[PDB]
């Protein structure tokens, strides 16, 4: 895992590019990743 640096990140098939930062969002056990108003990924949980 890398943080605070642009990367080609992949999470269980969800692919994207950019920086990661500590999340203030409170997910629920069934929830895996988070989307925003514009239907784009905004927060993701480490599967490990």
């Amino acid at each position: 895992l890398v943080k605070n640096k642009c990367v080609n990140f992949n999470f269980n098939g969800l692919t994207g590019t950019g920086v990661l930062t500590e999340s203030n969002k409170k997910f629920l056990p069934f929830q895996q990743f988070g989307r925003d108003i514009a239907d784009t990924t905004d927060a993701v949980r480490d599967p490990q």
Binding site: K25, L28, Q31, Q32, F33, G34, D36, I37, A43
Partner: peptide, 21 residues
């Protein structure tokens, strides 16, 4: 016998987090 379902039969459509949307 029969009855009325007011607001039952609702579930999370997918394993996706959202907020105030």
């Amino acid at each position: 016998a029969y009855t009325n379902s007011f607001t039952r039969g609702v579930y999370y459509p997918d394993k996706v987090f959202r907020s105030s949307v």
